[PDB]
Design a protein around this nucleic acid. Sequence first.
RNA 1: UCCGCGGUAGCUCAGGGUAGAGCAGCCGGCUGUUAACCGGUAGGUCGCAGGUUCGAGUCCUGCCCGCGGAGCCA
RNA 2: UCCGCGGUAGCUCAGGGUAGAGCAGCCGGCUGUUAACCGGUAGGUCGCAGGUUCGAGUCCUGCCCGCGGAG
Lengths: 377, 372
Amino acid sequence: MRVLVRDLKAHVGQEVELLGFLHWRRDLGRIQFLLLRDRSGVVQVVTGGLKLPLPESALRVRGLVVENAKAPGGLEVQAKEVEVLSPALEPTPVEIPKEEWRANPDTLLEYRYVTLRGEKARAPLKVQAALVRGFRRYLDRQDFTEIFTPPQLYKQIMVGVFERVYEVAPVWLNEYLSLDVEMGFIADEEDLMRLEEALLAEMLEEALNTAGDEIRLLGATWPSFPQDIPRLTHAEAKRILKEELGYPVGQDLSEEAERLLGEYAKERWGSDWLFVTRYPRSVRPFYTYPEEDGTTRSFDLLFRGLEITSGGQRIHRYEELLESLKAKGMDPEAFHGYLEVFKYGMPPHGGFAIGAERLTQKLLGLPNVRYARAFPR
Amino acid sequence: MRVLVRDLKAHVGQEVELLGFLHWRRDLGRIQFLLLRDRSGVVQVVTGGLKLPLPESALRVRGLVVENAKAPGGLEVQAKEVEVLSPALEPTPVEIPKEEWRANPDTLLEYRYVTLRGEKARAPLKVQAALVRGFRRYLDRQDFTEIFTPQLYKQIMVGVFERVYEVAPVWRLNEYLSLDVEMGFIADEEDLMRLEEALLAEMLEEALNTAGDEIRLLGATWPSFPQDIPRLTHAEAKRILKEELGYPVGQDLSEEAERLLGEYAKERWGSDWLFVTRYPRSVRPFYTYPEEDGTTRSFDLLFRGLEITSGGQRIHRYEELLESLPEAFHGYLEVFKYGMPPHGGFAIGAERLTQKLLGLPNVRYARAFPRD
RNA sequence: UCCGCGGUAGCUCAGGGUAGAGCAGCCGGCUGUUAACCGGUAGGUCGCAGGUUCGAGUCCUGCCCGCGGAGCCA
RNA sequence: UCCGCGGUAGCUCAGGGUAGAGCAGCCGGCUGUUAACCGGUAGGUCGCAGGUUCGAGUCCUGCCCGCGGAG
Ligand SMILES: [Mg+2]
């Protein structure tokens, strides 16, 4: 029976079998040390004599668990046998154990197919899966049906079918993971924003539970709790940036602007979260539910200065869609295929999407969003 | 506080608020009958006089729950107020309530955006969702890590997490959902075949739990339990098709052959499931683990005569990859220079599994928005 | 296009006269290493193709990749 | 590729001389409908483009599309 590094303290004094990779080796001749990496951690293995493969070789190690303050984690294994399941032919391009430092951020990307093996490298990917797991959990408990489509339209079509649906699919920095929610029979864009506060809360919970070790391994600072998130109207934000930050802003907020509104919110409310509501019709799709004062039932979520979520209520009346197409100078009978479904009693609905990697990145304090993705372009 | 159709019996004699669509209406003058569909089913609503929107209109109904044998499901609502949240402008192309019949197969597909609203139409989709919920739940409990990629990638991720899975769309009917599993540090293909059995079991369990009503609605027949599934080597099955089924088979089993082997399994073992092991190298990808006798550590799962799973062990020795090819795949091989664990995997065709489980006429019924 | 900084060993980087050293590697040595270190030894499209020079990694010309600034963006 | 059935209201199918019927739609009637039905009414690229005929959904030449069938 195999034992994971994370379960060693329970087998202190016992004989154990280990399966992992040769993380790193230090040969002193008479005695030598093995760092053995598995999906749960790394553990020191003591031995001697016998030749060892190059690092990154698949290994089976059978030995005796022992306490030792000298070893990382306070525990080590005295080797009785070291079997090699798969030997490494050459030395790795980069010294994996000596990451993240020791290798420029760019070199790490050129050798993703092996640098990803590092503890800190894989960590974000583990935390992300946790976030997504909690994502589905909550929505499922809330009577959401997961759908599998071939984009904005299909979700909508499915609302007249299941009332509440969600999807986790790739979209086109470049190619990213998008967590899309869409629910029917709502009152207004408020219903959506409330759902997202609860959903995010759950998503973070799941990460904190099933991905604690990784979260601590990265030394990330956990955000304030996603509840009663501050709301600013696009106009209100436009004014603050101007009069208080001396940063002239256009009709649409730039990444640079959102960064500032973030820092602003962190100071006035001590909140790592910020809701920007009521965008102008001009900067939002034609299907966005319009308001009388020239704005729209929309919103963006700024987590730590970065936008991680965009959504709002859609138009559901057939005529009001044409109305919106004309006002935005667009050919109505070019959207004939899209308009069809709205001829048949479409409920008041709306949705939003979360950027998995954006969220992951700003959560773990990663330098670049590309770290939150397994294989960037 | 909204009440779903499935929760009405607990509210008899009380005042409830319903949210759904006008599934159908029967107007008899001073009295009319509404069939109100929501995500949990349809209930009969009684009223009279007032104009009712065309079918398929979004509605809000406040009324009193009442027992009545004449009513479908034994329950009906006497409405005190009928609010219209969104009127339908035109009649639907097809009479949704009168599906599946009453409309040719190819027609339902041409009006998906609305016919999908039928109870039997959406049923498979709800079930496929359950099957996938189970898929993830099990693998999660077994220390698997879910990954999100742009075949090779899954392998690379093995040296990172040892055990990974992914639920992603593929191409190669035209666009289908694939449930891919890949795990390292295995003994042989047996470890994989044993995992798939335990997996399918958990999956069908989840379908039963969370998609029970739909499974009953479609009137499907449940398969035998996926355990100790009969195994049959490619050579062995080849012979059976020939001598006992008089169906000449080439170097590769055609769909027609696979369907006959299914009927065979149901007779000999009374099993809706069947593994086909040991395929000739010639008829399997280069990355497949070769054997001494020309065969390979591969397998195919035949659910009710239809392949729903294909897999086997992969080659993990850098040299043996060129040996089974070379410099064309220079970017692929690179990872195999650095201690690749003995590994393997398989992928499940989500729609295929859902189709054959629910006895659907054709695979496209399991897909929300099929290609053409 | 102009200015500036970058392009040198598997990795990180030094430098008008052999192109050099740490880490990774190889050989030898070493019973407690935490980025072990000691000796020896291998390792190159110095960006590429042409010039000045006895001599070019260094200077000249053109061109290729990258970052920042100026400019351009009727 | 060949062969054989198909293509008519929206849907599903009737048939050498206004192109029709029930389903739903519209108007009118009905307090227990389960695919409610009674009357009235609206609804067309008869596949598309060329021929025979005084007249073609109907026949005959080519093509597009669907289903099915062949070692
Ligand atoms: Mg000029």
